[PDB]
C-alpha cells in the first residue's frame, strides 16, 4: 500500500474546517506542509440539462439526482494562476490542486487499505510517486461503470461511484481543454458527460454467451480479468445501441489486466472509410444482426492487485481518450516525441503507463498532437455538440 514517497495522513472531520455565483466556499485544512486556504463555487447550471445518470440493473433502471451543490471548482487564495477541482460531501472528498507546477491530490483512504469503513484523506504530491470555430467544441461522452468498478471503488453505493466518475471526467476535461492542438488558438476541443450508466450488478447470461458485464472472463476463468482487446470488442458489441447517439462511450472497470496494461481504445482516423474513433461511424456485423459502433474505450483502475491512485487512473483515462481522438502511441525512437526522464519525462500516449514521474506527463506531445488535430478537424463538423455548461 505504501509505495509512493509522500503519503501524509489527514482526517476530514477534524482538520477540514470548511468555513463559508450561487454558493461560495472558503474551506481550509492543514494538509502536508501548507495551510491550504481554498475558494470554491458550485451551481445548478454546471450540470447539463440532459445530464441523466442511470443506475441499471437486471431489467430494472433508476435515475440518481446528482447533487449540484457538491462538485466545487475555484482557485486557491493568493494564487490566481491556480486551478483546483473538488467534491465535498459528509465523508466523500476528492480534491485536486494545481499550483506552482506541483500537484496536490486527495482521496478517501477506504480505496487502498482494503477496509471500506475507514474515513481519512490521502494528501500527496504527484511529483513524488515512486515509479478554430467555437460552438462545436464538445464531445458528449457516455460513461459506463461495470459491476466490478461499482463494487470495488464505490463501496457498493451508487453515489460514491458517480461522484468519483464525474470527478475523474472533469479532471480529464480540464487536461483536454488546456491543450492547443495546432500550437495556436485552436484549443478547447475537450469532452463532457452526456449520460452515466452504472451497472450495479453482474448481468446473468446463458451458458456459452458473452457480455462485457458478466461475472467471469472470456479467455479463461482461471484469470481474474479479460483480454484487453476481447473485452473492448465485447463492450463495443454490447453498447452498440446506446453508443449511436453519443460521441464516445467509455467503459470503466476494475480488474488486473495482463502484462501491466490498464486501458486501450479504438484508434481514431479522419478518413471517411475508417470506423472507430471520435465519430459514431456505422459498421454492420452479422454475428449480432445489428450495427456496431467502434467509438468505444476502456479504463481499468487496478494493476498488480492494488487499487491505483486517482492520478494514474486519470492518466490512463486520458491516454485511452487520446487513442480515441486519433492519436497513436508515441515512438520511443525520437526524444522529441518522447524524451528521457531527466528532460521532463515521458509524454502522454506512451506505450507504457506512467503516472506522475514528471510535469509534462499530463501533456500531449506534438508528435501525437498532430494526429489528434487531424482527426478533430474532420470529425468536429460531424459529431461535436455545444458545451451546454460552464
Amino acid at each position, epitope marked *: 500500500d505504501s509505495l509512493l514517497s509522500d503519503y501524509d495522513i489527514l482526517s476530514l472531520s477534524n482538520i477540514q474546517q470548511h468555513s463559508v455565483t450561487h454558493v461560495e466556499t472558503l474551506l481550509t485544512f492543514s494538509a502536508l506542509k501548507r495551510h491550504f486556504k481554498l475558494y470554491l463555487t458550485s451551481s445548478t447550471e454546471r450540470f447539463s440539462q440532459n445530464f441523466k445518470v442511470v443506475v441499471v440493473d437486471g431489467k430494472n433502471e433508476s435515475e440518481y439526482t446528482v447533487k449540484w451543490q457538491d462538485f466545487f471548482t475555484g482557485h486557491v487564495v493568493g494564487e490566481p494562476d491556480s486551478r483546483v477541482l473538488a467534491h465535498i460531501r459528509d465523508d466523500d472528498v476528492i480534491i485536486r490542486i494545481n499550483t506552482d507546477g506541483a500537484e496536490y491530490n486527495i482521496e478517501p483512504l477506504w480505496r487502498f487499505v482494503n477496509d471500506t469503513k475507514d474515513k481519512r484523506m490521502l494528501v500527496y504530491k504527484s511529483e513524488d510517486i515512486k515509479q478554430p470555430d467555437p460552438m462545436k467544441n464538445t464531445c458528449k461522452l457516455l460513461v459506463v461503470a461495470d459491476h466490478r468498478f461499482y463494487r470495488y471503488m464505490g463501496r457498493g453505493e451508487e453515489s460514491t461511484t458517480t461522484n468519483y466518475l464525474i470527478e475523474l471526467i472533469d479532471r480529464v476535461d480540464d487536461i483536454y481543454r488546456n491543450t492547443s492542438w495546432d500550437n495556436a488558438g485552436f484549443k478547447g476541443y475537450g469532452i463532457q458527460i452526456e449520460q452515466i450508466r452504472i451497472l450495479k450488478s453482474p448481468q446473468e447470461v446463458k451458458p456459452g454467451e458473452k457480455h462485457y458485464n458478466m461475472a467471469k472472463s*472470456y479467455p479463461n476463468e482461471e484469470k481474474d480479468a479479460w483480454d484487453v*482487446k476481447m473485452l*473492448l470488442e465485447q463492450f463495443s*458489441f454490447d453498447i452498440a445501441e446506446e453508443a449511436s447517439k453519443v460521441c464516445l462511450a467509455h467503459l470503466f472497470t476494475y480488474q488486473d489486466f495482463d502484462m501491466g496494461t490498464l486501458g486501450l481504445a479504438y484508434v481514431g482516423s479522419p478518413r471517411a472509410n475508417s470506423h472507430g474513433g471520435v465519430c459514431p461511424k456505422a459498421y*454492420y456485423s452479422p*454475428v449480432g444482426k445489428k450495427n456496431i459502433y467502434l467509438n468505444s474505450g476502456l479504463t481499468s483502475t487496478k494493476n498488480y492487485g492494488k487499487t491505483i491512485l486517482t492520478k494514474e487512473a486519470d492518466l490512463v483515462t486520458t491516454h485511452e481518450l487520446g487513442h480515441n481522438f486519433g492519436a497513436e502511441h508515441d515512438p520511443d525512437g525520437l526524444a522529441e516525441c518522447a524524451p528521457n526522464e531527466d528532460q521532463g519525462g515521458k509524454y502522454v500516449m506512451y506505450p507504457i503507463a506512467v503516472s506522475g514521474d514528471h510535469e509534462n506527463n499530463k501533456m500531449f506531445s506534438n508528435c501525437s498532437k498532430q494526429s489528434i488535430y487531424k482527426t478533430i478537424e474532420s470529425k468536429a463538423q460531424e459529431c461535436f455538440q455545444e458545451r451546454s455548461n460552464k
Partner: antibody
Amino acid sequence: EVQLLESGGGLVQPGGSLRLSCAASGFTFSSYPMNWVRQAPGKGLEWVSYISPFGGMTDYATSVKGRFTISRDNSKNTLYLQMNSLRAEDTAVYYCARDAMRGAEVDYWGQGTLVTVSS
Amino acid sequence: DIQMTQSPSSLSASVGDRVTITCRSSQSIPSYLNWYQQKPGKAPKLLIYAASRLQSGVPSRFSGSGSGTDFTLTISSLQPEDFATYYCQQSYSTPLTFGGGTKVEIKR
C-alpha cells in the same frame, strides 16, 4: 495492392487436421473482420466461418460447428483456420475473404487452397 | 436459417441483350444483399453491395434493385468480358449463405 496469400491444403485422410493460414497483407489486419469460404469442386460456394476483428465474436456454419476453429494472431498478421476430424464431404477449395469493414459484404478474396481428402 | 434462391440457373444471351438475374430470399432481408462474379479459375469478385449500390471498381453497367424479399441484379449490356457465374449473398444473419449460382454464356 491488397493480397491474401493462403498456405496449407493437401491430401489428408479422414479424421486429420489442417492449419491453413491467411497471410493477409497490404491493409490494417487488426481492424478488418475476415471470413473463411469454401468451394466444392465444380459446384456452388458457401460461407464457412466468421471472426470479429479482435477475435471476440467467432461463429461458423451449421455443418462445421463442432469440428472447426478459427483464430487470428494479429501480431503475426495472419489468419488461421484449424479444422479437426475432417470428413470426406470437406473436399473443397477454401477461400479466405476479408469482410467489408463497411456494411456487411466482402471486398477482397484469397486464391484458395485445394483441400482434398481421401484415404 | 436463411435460404437463398437464384433464377434462372443457366441463361443464354447475346452481347447487347439485357440480362436480368433474380435472387429471391426465404425471408425479408432489410437491405443487406450483395452479388459476386467469379470467372472459372479465379477468385470471386464483388460487384454490387446493399442490393442497390455498385462497388468502387465494377463498371456502371451492373445495376441492382429490389427490397424486402424480391432482389434483382440487372446488367444493361453483356460486354464479352462479363460472361461468368454470379452468386448472390445475404449478409443479414449469422449463417450467411450464398445463392445456388447462375451462369451466363455466349448465345450463338
